[PDB]
Design an enzyme around this catalytic site. Structure first.
Site, PDB file in Angstrom:
ATOM      1  N   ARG A 199      37.037  22.999  32.983  1.00 41.72           N
ATOM      2  CA  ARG A 199      36.713  22.696  34.408  1.00 41.72           C
ATOM      3  C   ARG A 199      37.906  23.763  35.628  1.00 41.72           C
ATOM      4  NH1 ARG A 199      38.267  16.422  33.417  1.00 41.72           N
ATOM      5  NH2 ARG A 199      36.067  15.755  32.592  1.00 41.72           N
ATOM      6  N   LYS A 222      27.793  16.196  32.356  1.00 48.23           N
ATOM      7  CA  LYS A 222      26.812  15.467  34.140  1.00 48.23           C
ATOM      8  C   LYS A 222      25.715  16.107  34.661  1.00 48.23           C
ATOM      9  CE  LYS A 222      31.953  13.423  34.627  1.00 48.23           C
ATOM     10  NZ  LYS A 222      32.502  13.399  35.801  1.00 48.23           N
ATOM     11  N   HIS A 259      32.366  14.403  31.190  1.00 50.13           N
ATOM     12  CA  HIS A 259      32.900  13.673  30.786  1.00 50.13           C
ATOM     13  C   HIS A 259      33.730  13.442  29.778  1.00 50.13           C
ATOM     14  CE1 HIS A 259      34.415   9.290  30.035  1.00 50.13           C
ATOM     15  NE2 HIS A 259      33.980   9.627  29.080  1.00 50.13           N
ATOM     16  N   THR A 287      41.499  16.483  35.892  1.00 54.14           N
ATOM     17  CA  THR A 287      40.163  15.982  36.290  1.00 54.14           C
ATOM     18  C   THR A 287      39.774  16.203  37.549  1.00 54.14           C
ATOM     19  OG1 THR A 287      40.755  13.652  35.922  1.00 54.14           O
ATOM     20  CG2 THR A 287      39.388  13.941  37.660  1.00 54.14           C
ATOM     21  N   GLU A 344      32.922   3.586  24.710  1.00 55.50           N
ATOM     22  CA  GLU A 344      31.880   4.862  25.453  1.00 55.50           C
ATOM     23  C   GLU A 344      30.573   5.341  23.959  1.00 55.50           C
ATOM     24  OE1 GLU A 344      34.468   7.834  27.148  1.00 55.50           O
ATOM     25  OE2 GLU A 344      34.877   6.001  28.417  1.00 55.50           O
TER      26      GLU A 344
HETATM   27  C1  LIG Z   1      34.072  12.130  39.213  1.00 47.73           C
HETATM   28  C2  LIG Z   1      35.473  11.740  39.003  1.00 47.73           C
HETATM   29  C3  LIG Z   1      35.959  11.193  38.466  1.00 47.73           C
HETATM   30  N1  LIG Z   1      37.469  10.262  38.859  1.00 47.73           N
HETATM   31  C4  LIG Z   1      38.119   9.428  37.958  1.00 47.73           C
HETATM   32  C5  LIG Z   1      37.375   8.651  37.060  1.00 47.73           C
HETATM   33  C6  LIG Z   1      37.374   8.192  35.442  1.00 47.73           C
HETATM   34  O1  LIG Z   1      39.217   7.569  36.042  1.00 47.73           O
HETATM   35  C7  LIG Z   1      37.864   9.386  35.256  1.00 47.73           C
HETATM   36  C8  LIG Z   1      37.150  10.164  34.359  1.00 47.73           C
HETATM   37  O2  LIG Z   1      35.912  10.026  35.541  1.00 47.73           O
HETATM   38  P1  LIG Z   1      34.657  10.726  34.440  1.00 47.73           P
HETATM   39  O3  LIG Z   1      33.764   9.407  33.519  1.00 47.73           O
HETATM   40  O4  LIG Z   1      33.334  10.621  35.139  1.00 47.73           O
HETATM   41  O5  LIG Z   1      34.883  12.169  33.849  1.00 47.73           O
HETATM   42  O6  LIG Z   1      37.931  10.551  36.107  1.00 47.73           O
HETATM   43  C9  LIG Z   1      37.891  10.626  39.683  1.00 47.73           C
HETATM   44  O7  LIG Z   1      39.439  10.570  40.822  1.00 47.73           O
HETATM   45  N2  LIG Z   1      37.686  11.838  40.716  1.00 47.73           N
HETATM   46  C10 LIG Z   1      36.186  11.774  40.270  1.00 47.73           C
HETATM   47  O8  LIG Z   1      35.745  12.402  41.340  1.00 47.73           O
END
Ligand SMILES: Cc1cn([C@H]2C[C@H](O)[C@@H](COP(=O)(O)O)O2)c(=O)[nH]c1=O
Ligand SMILES: Cc1cn([C@H]2C[C@H](O)[C@@H](COP(=O)(O)O)O2)c(=O)[nH]c1=O
Ligand SMILES: Cc1cn([C@H]2C[C@H](O)[C@@H](COP(=O)(O)O)O2)c(=O)[nH]c1=O
Lengths: 149, 149, 149
Positions: free
Chosen positions: B102, B10, B115, B91, B126
């Site tokens: 993370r 990201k 991601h 997450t 994807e």
């Molecule tokens: C960036 C972010 C993603 N997510 C969730 C959304 C997607 O279902 C999953 C993966 O998101 P990502 O593709 O941004 O990693 O994480 C959150 O709950 N909180 C956040 O701050």
């Protein structure tokens, strides 16, 4: 909101010459160094540091291990008091999770490299014990927009 | 029997300049780089990437955090979809296990560096969204006999 | 009280050229190298090493994978038999915890980089099989006062 925690590298961290490695682990998360000081810990300040253990039979041994060079530190970040505890790992290195400081560097609780505040109240007390307010430095990390949501 | 997952660094991973460290974690397990591309993510592609959250109040904020430079990647390995998820960690970085990306690098979910596809169906979708078939590279790792049983 | 464990870098660790990284993980905890020898493992010695699995259908393939260069090692430390097992992680790398050797380097059980004794009885048996007693060295680490409590 960020908070601040007191982290102290114990004499075994100094003597094993892993100070930079320890600092790097906290910098890697975008935690901000708000204070840092090398001193030699003495029994009188350690008695106050370990005040919760006043009168306990093991207190003299705790003080002896800690009488030596230490690196006093304050790190700032989101939830940093609890997160730094998680990063240090269990008191006993043998019970600590792989990837934590104590699991990765140590064998026994009496030589477990690093102290960190166990609560908001302890962090406030410990920061005040080891640092004067004029030693606590306020600045903003240039990468803040990419560290904080 | 290997599979392929979509992993994306990201904008915070780019700006904090930890791209190489991230790649090295996956290379270290003998995962094969099958595709890699730096791009600037657009709202249009991110709406499709985050299609599961269409209409949700937090979607605009998700897209805003992601509108910037990203490194698109495909890695191949045994069970690599689930394994890369385990390596990234929860997450929320504060809930992630020590030793995960993370937990080691981040503080908040909104800036959690990377991601990865969450399932076989999501990986196929994807990879197809972010890469053309001609960008997916097939070759064999010379150390295959010492990586795979 | 310290103990000693038998740790062996398998041919995949040699061929992937991560010998030094593996040793560094154990040195990092102040474990002492008591013995170290490079050899090429042969079927006759491997049959004894894997004696408990005599006759099982997977044994011939296991012996084939292990016929190659290996680094025989003895490390000494507090609780080192159990701790080295914890540091290696689960036999199956996909089940191993982040931060363990097998989770960080490997994909499948048949190529899981390293062996370590599973018990005091196995450590004694394996050290006798792979080393001559002339090869076990007695000396003291200079940082002992800061490693042991
Ligand atoms: C960036 C972010 C993603 N997510 C969730 C959304 C997607 O279902 C999953 C993966 O998101 P990502 O593709 O941004 O990693 O994480 C959150 O709950 N909180 C956040 O701050
Ligand atoms: C050094 C040490 C501390 N502790 C406890 C004392 C304190 O309650 C807590 C934090 O101690 P610390 O400030 O020395 O890290 O850990 C042990 O139980 N065993 C030990 O060997
Ligand atoms: C290499 C390997 C070992 N094992 C088991 C056999 C032994 O009981 C234990 C340790 O074996 P090792 O000496 O090869 O590390 O792991 C498996 O179950 N699957 C494998 O692929």
């Amino acid at each position: 909101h960020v908070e601040q925690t007191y982290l102290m590298i114990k004499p075994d961290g100094i003597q094993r010459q892993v100070v930079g490695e320890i600092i790097s682990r906290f910098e890697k998360r975008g935690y901000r160094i708000a204070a840092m000081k090398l001193t030699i810990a003495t029994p009188a300040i350690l008695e106050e540091h370990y005040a919760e253990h006043k009168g306990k039979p093991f207190l003299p041994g705790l003080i002896e291990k800690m009488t030596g060079p230490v690196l006093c530190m304050v790190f700032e970040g989101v939830d940093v008091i609890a997160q730094a505890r998680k990063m240090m790992g269990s008191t006993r290195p043998g019970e600590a999770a792989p990837g934590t400081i104590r699991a990765d560097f140590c064998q026994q609780a009496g030589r477990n490299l690093i102290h960190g505040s166990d609560s908001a109240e302890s962090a406030k007390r410990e920061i005040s014990l080891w640092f004067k307010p004029e030693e606590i430095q306020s600045y903003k990390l240039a990468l803040s927009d990419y560290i904080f949501e």
